[PDB]
Amino acid sequence: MTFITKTPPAAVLLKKAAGIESGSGEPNRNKVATIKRDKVREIAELKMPDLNAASIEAAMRMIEGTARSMGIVVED
Template sequence: MTTQKKVSRQVTLELEAGNAAMVDIGKMLGPTGVNTRQLKLDYDEATAPQRGEIVPVVVTVFEDRSYALRYKTPPTAHLIRKAVGLEKGAGRPGSQTVAKLSREQLREIAERKLPDLNTDDVEAAMRQIAGTARSMGVLVAD
């Protein structure tokens, strides 16, 4: 019979892939007693191929101070900004357009985000991504 570890805390962190900031990790997980240096090394090693992107991770901390990491896909807004080459979205979305996203780019982002979305239909995922793009002032081309 296997005994399940008891979860003491679960936190989602958005960190830079391959180069997580110790400050962010320490601020959120310092009070739990987890070895933050080892957690940073584990995260950096696992996300090294995605350097330059933001990769969220769900950290589950157990009562014995061990942890488990579950990686998610980068935030939708980050992927849209990267695809169209923006630093940030529009100041007044709806009345201001700052970039144009092609259908191909929209499909690529939707396929990448699919594991984290509440659908398994690429067309539905594309509609969700298009909504985020519109809220950033990015026009979706037809």
Template sequence: MPPKQKKQMFQATLELTAGNAPVVDLGKMLGQTGVNLVEVKKSYDAATAGQRGDVVPVVVTVFEDRSFELRYKTPPTAFLIRKALGDKGSSRPGHESAGVLSRDRLREIAERKLPDLNTADVEAAMRTIAGTARSMGVSVES
């Protein structure tokens, strides 16, 4: 007889600071589920300790027996672009430039985001990342 599937009760995607998830944010989203917030925080912090300082989204699935499962994603594209530039995006995209992103940096970001994108081609991923950069007012080297 196959093992029983746990019944999913709640699922949410949270964008938390890697290695130091604030319990307040966890409490706002997961408090009503009755899951042990301290255990969720410990699991998240342990898994993301190597990326400390980045924003790492996580999909939290809570089951009826109040157990949970965490599925980690890659940092948001806009966050990676801002980190590569060391600056923020433009307050007026299309009018003011926020900087220039080199092809090498664009490739690094695309390779890092590849698991979460709907393509397996690095060139297509680079075009997707370049589109996000342009919408932030960042120019991309040709």
């Protein structure tokens, strides 16, 4: 996936894949999808080989905080 196939940014990829299309569209309190680590897990795996992540748990760190930018909650 290194040929004109660059993945999207954590948030986008998160709000996109984990944040579905946009069940909200005009939210307010934020958080429109509560996915388990299984989502930020794969998501990080895809955007892992290309992102500046520093490690699995490291990707979830910046990946999770980024999710809070839209509404991709993450529960253990």
